[PDB]
Amino acid sequence: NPFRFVELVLVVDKAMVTKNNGDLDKIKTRMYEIVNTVNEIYRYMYIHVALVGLEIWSNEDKITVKPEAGYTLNAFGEWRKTDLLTRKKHDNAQLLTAIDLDRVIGLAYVGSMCHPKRSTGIIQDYSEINLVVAVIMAHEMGHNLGINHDSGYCSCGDYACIMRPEISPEPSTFFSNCSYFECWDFIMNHNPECILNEPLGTDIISPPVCGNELLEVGEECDCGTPENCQNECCDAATCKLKSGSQCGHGDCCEQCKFSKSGTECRASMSECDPAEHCTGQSSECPADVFHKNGQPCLDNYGYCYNGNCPIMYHQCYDLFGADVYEAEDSCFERNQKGNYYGYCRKENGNKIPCAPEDVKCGRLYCKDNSPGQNNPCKMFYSNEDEHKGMVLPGTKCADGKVCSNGHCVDVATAY
Ligand SMILES: *[C@@H]1O[C@H](CO[C@@H]2O[C@@H](C)[C@@H](O)[C@@H](O)[C@@H]2O)[C@@H](O[C@@H]2O[C@H](CO)[C@@H](O[C@@H]3O[C@H](CO[C@H]4O[C@H](CO)[C@@H](O)[C@H](O)[C@@H]4O[C@@H]4O[C@H](CO)[C@@H](O)[C@H](O)[C@H]4NC(C)=O)[C@@H](O[C@@H]4O[C@H](CO)[C@@H](O)[C@H](O)[C@H]4NC(C)=O)[C@H](O[C@H]4O[C@H](CO)[C@@H](O)[C@H](O)[C@@H]4O[C@@H]4O[C@H](CO)[C@@H](O)[C@H](O)[C@H]4NC(C)=O)[C@@H]3O)[C@H](O)[C@H]2NC(C)=O)[C@H](O)[C@H]1NC(C)=O
Ligand SMILES: [Ca+2]
Ligand SMILES: [Ca+2]
Ligand SMILES: [Ca+2]
Ligand SMILES: [Zn+2]
Would you say the CB of residue 155 lies under 6 angstroms from ligand 1? Predict the structure, then answer.
């Protein structure tokens, strides 16, 4: 499955309530439709958007909604991280305000999808035309998905695309080819892990809609509209499986049927990750099971850590390729410097040096056994992502010891 899922939560401020004369039912109904249109707009981007939560501040705003966008975006962000996200798990949150923002009609951090605070954006109820607001909502989520404004020859047909500097009076539902590549460039490089999981029917607060491509409660299947449906198992028009079909979706659903009992549905990462197999009775693949952390693995060279067996040797290979091995102990003393590359961990942004003991849990050093090479302490550093090149957590840093937050500690007390 190529599709990504953005579990969204919409927050509506007091102004919005006052604007709608206190009719919450009207507000909710409209929000449902808008998020449904945002989901269509994103079909092209191989992304789905589901409303998992809707909070209406009918009594009092939980933050001060100022016409000064920056202040509001920031305030709304902190609020999501310290309050909302603490009682409702979601990937992105948008604030719909009826207040007349200064100069802009929306605002959102860029390339911040999944970040507890920066995975947000504010939107002004600029118009009564649902599509107009939906486009603004999508546009702001776009910035979140590392997407920037269109320019030059970026197109989406002879239509005003979603990522234009300013909203069009005759808006469309199409993204520009630039927004596409840009969007996925973000998902490829940075890894918004939080949008991988497919939301569960019950997680969706919006009334189920047949044909929105979101398998929702009460529906056997949902392959979009009859025109877009590519599912031989589903009857697009009704969201009912064809007579004779056992399933219509799932890692264990093959040509409208349950995969044969025992067919692998979730591959094994390593020996510490036992693969799962289909039962033959369901279209769903059994839960992901991991062997216990701390369990010896790879011929007693490592200890299991969250389904993997991180070891110096493999970690070096992943960085410099074959015929490359772990460097001598002496090389690891560079991690005591506490400089730009030789540290053990980071405190609020400061690089902390490795204490003599935790030396093997900081920056990883490898030896090159090629002719004339000469460099005994090869290492990798890129201010693009400082963590890359750092020893993976759970890596066996010593006999009976594993790495934990830049500390070489006893396995027995590690987990
Ligand atoms: C997303 O997908 C897009 C495809 O969309 C498709 O079309 C949509 C409408 C929609 O239907 C959709 O469904 C379709 O898929 C891609 O769009 C393409 O982008 C590239 C650039 O990334 C475009 O190229 C530009 O085109 C500029 C305009 O030239 C065309 O138009 C003029 C006037 O109308 C015409 O005279 C030209 O012959 C040319 O015509 C095109 O020719 C190609 C040939 O293959 C045909 O396929 C097209 O069908 C045809 N289109 C038209 C309009 O009929 C170029 O700029 C012009 O350059 C000349 C000199 O070469 C200059 O005299 C003009 O003033 C100038 N015009 C303007 C207004 O700027 C441009 O070339 C300049 O820039 C490049 C940089 O890329 C330089 O290397 C060159 O030196 C060149 O000149 C210099 O440019 C710099 C600026 O960079 C100036 O500062 C400098 O002074 C200047 N120096 C010179 C030489 O004087 C490129 O050729 C291409 O046309 C788009 N295709 C279409 C169909 O629109 C997106 O790329 C894609 N995005 C991604 C990445 O995914
Ligand atoms: Ca998610
Ligand atoms: Ca549905
Ligand atoms: Ca497993
Ligand atoms: Zn913008």
Answer: yes
